[PDB]
Design a protein around this ligand. Structure first.
Ligand SMILES: Nc1nc2c(ncn2[C@@H]2O[C@H](COP(=O)(O)OP(=O)(O)OP(=O)(O)O)[C@@H](O)[C@H]2O)c(=O)[nH]1
Ligand SMILES: Nc1nc2c(ncn2[C@@H]2O[C@H](COP(=O)(O)OP(=O)(O)OP(=O)(O)O)[C@@H](O)[C@H]2O)c(=O)[nH]1
Ligand SMILES: Nc1nc2c(ncn2[C@@H]2O[C@H](COP(=O)(O)OP(=O)(O)O)[C@@H](O)[C@H]2O)c(=O)[nH]1
Ligand SMILES: Nc1nc2c(ncn2[C@@H]2O[C@H](COP(=O)(O)OP(=O)(O)O)[C@@H](O)[C@H]2O)c(=O)[nH]1
Ligand SMILES: [Mg+2]
Ligand SMILES: [Mg+2]
Lengths: 66, 438, 436, 431, 428
């Protein structure tokens, strides 16, 4: 019998198929050992190889801290 | 720079390729038109798509894959459907007449006509690539093209490219159900091209996916679209170490070192966890220790073979999402204490661990749930020997009365292929029992 | 004036080295851009030990970073403190070793060492009076143990009258994550025993154990594990950079520890480590450092000194502090633990005191312990290698690169001679003289 | 940290499980969704990455006609859909069908599900087994589930709350075959085993709670109150808390005897709750009255060997010791001569909670007793009379032989029952 | 300087220690946070006997808590004085004994002693001159008795030339709330008689009898029982901390109260116990303390010295007072009752005086008594043990855990020899 509360209200807008889950890694993304350059707004865990390519065989990219 | 050339040969290869390349486009943000909506003006630091796509000055990203088939009726769906602008027009190689469930027809007669065009497109992809990790093969044993034309393809690739890695994703015939009659002939004559001409070979059969997608994903009647989503999910998990940045990185030759103890033994067991519906994701606690035991559970295996009667020889674990290294070592520990599983006495530490940061993605209209953790496992087990011997009995039962042999002799091959492919398979089964001796 | 050239090998070496340059730049007061923003004048008095002057008052480290996979080099470049390194020093290949010792020592790493030794020679000859080298690497990989041991052999021939430290991550049985670890391990221990002056065994079990039951830490990430590794390696050479009452650099430490040139496998340990819920319940006093330094919990290897005998030990203290307690407490543990300390050598404890404490702490200490209990790790590596090499498992990955099967047999004999060599010194009669 | 994985088998097991888990949800403040509107819930409810609490219970039956209304009713969203295991074609009140023929197809699914719940326990106290001696699945399937659990798990605690057939009124005719063939196999495969009898609880609700027309549901609420008071010290703190192992080791003088009796007091209606004085002396005096017993046997013909008391609520250790002292002097009660002190005392702080639509009322203090008694032989010796009377002409035996069991299993179960009775009497024989 | 290391074993040991640290932190002026907040200088003069020094002028007790069940540990840490203890001092096992002596002494207690002997050696070597140890445990349960005897058995050889006290909750016939309790009592007294300097017998029957007859409290909770026993446990080590006109430390009590090495079972009492109604009407006078003490009701054991002989007697007084009335009254009680004392020891009385009274009280007294009446207790335990062992009752919980039958036989024979030794001084 009696009254039951419903599902808790979402504090922020949520939508699957586009949203990245909150992880320890994505919380400490700029402070982790093993994380490459962060130039992506979707996920900071997408690889960047601007520094790694040789001077030949390279397109004109942006070096980190430059 | 790191990148893999994926070839899809057969009607099974094309339909696997459709469901796996729609996962790659959604993972990297590619439209079916080929353009990337992101990086409209600037922001070119993202090059995670470099393993699978080639950048063109118009913004178009074409896949580095070739579709090979001998019947146009399944490849014209790709040329007409929603991905008709993404693929290159010349990377969908189309034959004239199919091999028609025949090893000899697709190896000695029809397979010699389009071999030159396929080797031309491979060389164009091989000259375009700058550092090649390996080749990925998607094919089926039971078909004429998937067994016959594939067998000549690995021998020509071995002569051209010597040290390149060659991974195999083969559709092994299921033990009780199937779709054809001459499957034991086509599956036993392809043992030579998967023994000496394949660096790694993952076997899958359809019925071990059928019961998984029935009792775990709670949908009452799946079809071939739902099988290829789970098959294509493993290939993304294997190549996620190259594409997305992680704490531990595993190259293609990294797990070949830790899963191939001898060149004759290169047949791992693929499994994936978790595979749950959106209904059950609301109910079940999903943790690192609770997904590393689903890979070890024999009911969730992807090959109809029981590792309880076998013994493990090596293991490779690939993690996705927030899997901290604390719970990896805590969960591997309790795996070693339980005595239900068994390890060989000459491999004291049998585990290889790779951790990637990016969680897996989902597809609209899909059946898997949006989770934070995932794991795929590639384990060597002696229980493949009982998987071969079940089909080995059916081949000897069929060949005693000499049935369908006139369909193979009249195409151009000798009758000595059947006795030879029976004998070296028997020596390979005799090989597996000896390694399993403690 | 006394320069230490830093050497980083492998992915594990770069994660350790990146945290190490972060921890001592904060100690010397260096911003990530490269300038100096501090409050004291003695921080620049001895800064050429690890740093090299550049234009505009900029300091760049005397480190070279070497790997066979370019994925780690971009991460250590674009990290939190990766801007200070000179981009010339980042040397790297394109194809990885593949967790294979034979690729790193014979085929793949044999072409990368020409570029590395040119950079190492270029950076070591610029010092007015070179003190010695220092290497951080892991024995469980291919590009750290395969090619790092080759860097060991070339440098020792070129610079014989120099002192070389190494920080080897010895593999672990319980938290092993690679199948071919004893293959990579026992083929490199022979190179470390012949051509290395000091070796420190750092184990991931003990880093996990300290982070679990001592720090009471929730998630021990690799950054937290490398936080402890950079602690002892910053504190072992603190008498070189800061003045003190009793100064002792790493050469004077080397003289007092090593009785015979085959006995140089040590155990590190950092003394003042407390948890968040127990720090304000504990007083910071010299007996409290000595008790937390000598127990087996804080040892950074998988060695229990109860099974063995302590051969010769160190304590390097930091902070403004009166060293009656330093001269008394290690005498008290000398007289009490009579069985643990070998009676063949009297008063084996070496003492150093540095005035300048670490930033934010008033008192600290560091431990180096040479014990015979280190031989249980080599025996464990021996039995895991014996059980698998006997079946010729994973052998085609090694014998296809040119090395024959007798290199494994001599690697067994060299390690079995090593474990027996420690065994004689553990059980030896002091009050006797032999035929000699 | 502590955990107790319950298993429910049989239609009686499902109906008891519904009444038990309704009490658990209202006691811990759980909605039937599983949401919270403190870690006392951790012994029964598993946390989830969605915030839900899933019970640590496994429902087993061969009947789909009772699991479905669990899957359709109020708690349809609480239970995980794979915890309610359902077979087919029933067992039809047969030991042989439930053990040898039908039970062997679903035993692997249950043991796989038990492994998937026993991997989550950092420390597990023990399993609780609820079953009925009469029906086929409660008799046949439980007999080999105990054997497979004993092989798989070494020395984990196994508690039983079994329903022994009543001597006067019951459901079936072949219930002596079902009851005897489990008593033989629950000797060496059970750690502790309580018995409840239906017609005595029928007498309890008739003359105490003023409900003259009860159902199984008013019956099942009383067993749920007993099981709650057993695990009450585990869930919540108290002055003298007691674990499962403590009364398991304080109630078995010998390994062959593990058959205590569970009583409850007070059990009174709301109108009588206003009147009566509920002191600890007045609740421990009702557990010794044979009219307030739960098993149809009188301890005045027997001897008390060991006793355990579970006080719940506003109890004081001082008045508890006084109430024990006044009991020990009267001669209506009688202890054995080799046990001068047979009492075990457990005290919990939190008072029991009631459910709406129930029968009890607001009570400040209650007691549950587990006394091992020499009075239970008259239950077994009369069942020896009922079984041998009906085995004399070999009635209904062809219904058991037809599944594959040997005739000699009946004869060896008779020698086991005779030996258990001849084990039994010498303990009652004084020195 | 002279430092006492405290030990707590079991649930009873934890409850009795939480109240004991509650009453002497108030005696030395310590807030629940831990900082000293006093009004004199004599309180701060001797703190190192029980406390350590910490950062910021904090004091943490020199105590270690031992249990095999974390349920009681959480209540101790969540109590009013649970913040003062260091978290490293709590040692708990994840699987308890369950009122079983064999679990605590052979199987389960063997793994847990490596941590306790690590912790107790870690803080006892920090003492400049360790004076002795102290243990509180209960014989009615196997958590603090099976391992509590093993902790004594391991600490004896490690620290031989020390003194250790134990406060044993000796079980009672009417408050017997566990069935296997005679097994736990008999098998622990055997270990207690051989490795202990000093033993104390505290019984819950006497604690209930005191709070009924004397204090007139309607609800005697365990907090009131812990108040009564810790008022004596603080009262026995007062000369160490508070200076007096005649001092007597724990070793000076032991040398005058243990004439033979197997006779160290003493039963205590506390003199100034008064109800609230009778508090207004009593007079604080020196003979009032000894007359309320030598009353046989006031004792803290289930035995009467009227049935026995007072072997030796000790009195420790609290408060600035004249000692001529102390010497006069104790001589008067010695000479008036000439049949309750042995003939072969003249001057059976040891006397000590402390200046500082307990807080809120004017004068107080504490009495330690060795008598032959303890053998009545030991025979009562042994008669129930031999009435239940002889039918092999509850033996499968002991013979199946690594114990043969000869341990029960030698436990009876040693207890039979001990009561015979006590009996020979009743007559001779
Ligand atoms: N897993 C999976 N297997 C498939 C799928 N589609 C086809 N197959 C496999 O394909 C086999 C049938 O033979 P095919 O591979 O189609 O034959 P083919 O490669 O076209 O060669 P021919 O028909 O002789 O020209 C069956 O045994 C299936 O196992 C699919 O979508 N998923
Ligand atoms: N005490 C008690 N016993 C019950 C209750 N409900 C059913 N029973 C017992 O259950 C017995 C009949 O078996 P069921 O539980 O109905 O069914 P089953 O155990 O699954 O066995 P099958 O009917 O053969 O499948 C009867 O003899 C009753 O004694 C109940 O609510 N309380
Ligand atoms: N202590 C510590 N160990 C590490 C770190 N990174 C990796 N490891 C260990 O190194 C092992 C693998 O080394 P690997 O990367 O193959 O060495 P490499 O191939 O020479 O770069 C793993 O077992 C890790 O436990 C680190 O930052 N700190
Ligand atoms: N005097 C006194 N006795 C207690 C106290 N707590 C428990 N007891 C007695 O100790 C017995 C139970 O002790 P138990 O908890 O089993 O001790 P453990 O097994 O060592 O934890 C009961 O019979 C109580 O009478 C207390 O605070 N004071
Ligand atoms: Mg085809
Ligand atoms: Mg039924």
């Amino acid at each position: 019998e009696l009254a039951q509360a419903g599902t808790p209200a979402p504090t922020k807008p949520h939508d699957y198929r586009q949203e990245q889950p909150e992880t320890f890694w994505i919380q400490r993304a700029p402070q982790l050992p093993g994380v490459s350059n962060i130039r992506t707004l979707d996920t900071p865990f997408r690889k960047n190889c601007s520094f790694s390519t040789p001077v030949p065989l390279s397109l004109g990219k942006l070096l980190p801290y430059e | 720079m790191r990148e893999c050339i994926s070839i899809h040969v057969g009607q099974a290869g094309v339909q696997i390729g459709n469901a796996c390349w729609e996962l790659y486009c959604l993972e990297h943000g590619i439209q079916p038109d080929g353009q990337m909506p992101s990086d409209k003006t600037i922001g070119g630091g993202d090059d995670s798509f470099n393993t699978f796509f080639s950048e063109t000055g118009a913004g178009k990203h074409v896949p580095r894959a070739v579709f090979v088939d001998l019947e146009p009726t399944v490849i014209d769906e790709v040329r007409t459907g929603t991905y008709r602008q993404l693929f290159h027009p010349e990377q969908l190689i189309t034959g004239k007449e199919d091999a028609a469930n025949n090893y000899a027809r697709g190896h000695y007669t029809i397979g010699k006509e389009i071999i030159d065009l396929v080797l031309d497109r491979i060389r164009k992809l091989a000259d375009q690539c700058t550092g090649l990790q390996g080749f990925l093969v998607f094919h089926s044993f039971g078909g004429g093209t998937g067994s016959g034309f594939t067998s000549l393809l690995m021998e020509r690739l071995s002569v051209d490219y010597g040290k390149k890695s060659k991974l195999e994703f083969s559709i092994y015939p299921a033990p009780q159900v199937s779709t054809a009659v001459v499957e034991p002939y086509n599956s036993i004559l392809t043992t030579h091209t998967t023994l000496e001409h394949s660096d790694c070979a993952f076997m899958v059969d359809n019925e071990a996916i059928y019961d998984i997608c029935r009792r775990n994903l709670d949908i009452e009647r799946p079809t071939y679209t739902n099988l290829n989503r789970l098959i294509g999910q493993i290939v993304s998990s294997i190549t996620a170490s190259l594409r997305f940045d992680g704490a531990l990185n595993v190259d293609l030759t990294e797990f070949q070192t830790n899963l191939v103890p001898y060149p004759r033994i290169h047949f791992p067991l693929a499994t994936y966890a978790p595979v749950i519906s959106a209904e059950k994701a609301y109910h079940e606690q999903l943790s690192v220790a609770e997904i590393t035991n689903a890979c070890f559970e024999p009911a969730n295996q992807m090959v109809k073979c029981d590792p309880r009667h076998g013994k493990y020889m090596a293991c490779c674990l690939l993690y996705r999402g927030d899997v901290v290294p604390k719970d990896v070592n805590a969960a591997i520990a309790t795996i070693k204490t339980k005595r239900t599983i068994q390890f060989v006495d000459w491999c004291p530490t049998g585990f290889k661990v790779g951790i990637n940061y990016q969680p897996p993605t989902v597809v609209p209209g899909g059946d898997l749930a949006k989770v934070q953790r995932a794991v795929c496992m590639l384990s060597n087990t002696t229980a493949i020997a009982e998987a071969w011997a079940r089909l080995d009995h059916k081949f000897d039962l069929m060949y005693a009365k000499r049935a369908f042999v006139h369909w193979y002799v009249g195409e151009g091959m000798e009758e000595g292929e059947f006795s030879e492919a029976r004998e070296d398979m028997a020596a390979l089964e005799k090989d597996y029992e000896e390694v399993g001796v403690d | 004036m006394r320069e230490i050239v830093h050497l980083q090998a492998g992915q594990c070496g770069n994660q350790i080295g990146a945290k190490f340059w972060e921890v001592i730049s904060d100690e010397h007061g260096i911003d990530p851009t490269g300038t100096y923003h501090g409050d004291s004048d003695l921080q620049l008095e001895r800064i050429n030990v690890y740093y090299n002057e550049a234009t505009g008052g900029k300091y760049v480290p005397r480190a070279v970073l070497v790997d066979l996979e370019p994925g780690t080099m971009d991460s250590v470049r674009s990290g939190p403190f990766g801007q200070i390194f000179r981009p010339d020093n980042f040397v790297f290949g394109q194809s990885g070793a593949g967790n294979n010792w034979a690729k790193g020592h014979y085929t793949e790493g044999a072409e990368l060492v020409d570029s590395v030794l040119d950079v190492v020679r270029k950076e070591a000859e610029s010092c007015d009076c070179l003190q010695g080298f220092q290497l951080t690497h892991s024995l469980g990989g291919g590009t750290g143990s395969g090619m790092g041991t080759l860097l060991i052999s070339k440098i020792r021939e070129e610079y014989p009258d120099r002192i070389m430290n190494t920080f080897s991550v010895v593999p672990s049985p319980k938290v092993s994550d690679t199948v071919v670890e004893p293959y990579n391990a026992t083929l490199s221990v022979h190179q470390l025993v012949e051509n290395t002056d000091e070796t420190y065994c750092i184990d991931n079990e003990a880093l996990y154990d300290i982070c679990f039951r001592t720090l009471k830490l929730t998630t021990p990430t690799y950054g937290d594990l490398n936080h402890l590794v950079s602690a002892t390696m910053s504190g072992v050479t603190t008498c070189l950079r800061f003045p003190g009452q009793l100064n002792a650099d790493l050469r004077k430490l080397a003289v007092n520890m090593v009785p015979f040139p085959r006995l140089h496998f040590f155990m590190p340990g950092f003394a003042p480590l407390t948890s968040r819920g127990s720090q304000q319940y504990r007083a910071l006093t010299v007996p409290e450092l000595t008790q937390q330094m000598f127990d087996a919990k804080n040892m950074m290897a998988a060695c229990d000194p109860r099974h063995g005998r302590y051969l010769t030990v160190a304590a390097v203290f930091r902070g403004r502090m009166s060293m009656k307690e330093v001269d008394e407490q290690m005498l008290n543990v000398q007289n009490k633990n009579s069985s643990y300390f070998v009676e063949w050598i009297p008063n084996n404890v070496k003492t150093a005191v540095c005035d300048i404490p670490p930033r934010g702490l008033k008192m600290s200490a560091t431990f180096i312990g040479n014990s015979t209990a280190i031989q249980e790790l080599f025996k464990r590596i021996s039995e895991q290698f014996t059980a698998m090499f006997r079946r010729k498992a994973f052998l085609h990955w090694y014998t296809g690169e040119g090395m024959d099967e007798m290199e494994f047999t001599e690697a067994e004999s060299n390690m079995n001679d090593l474990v027996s060599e420690y065994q004689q010194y553990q059980d030896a009669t002091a009050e006797e003289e032999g035929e000699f």
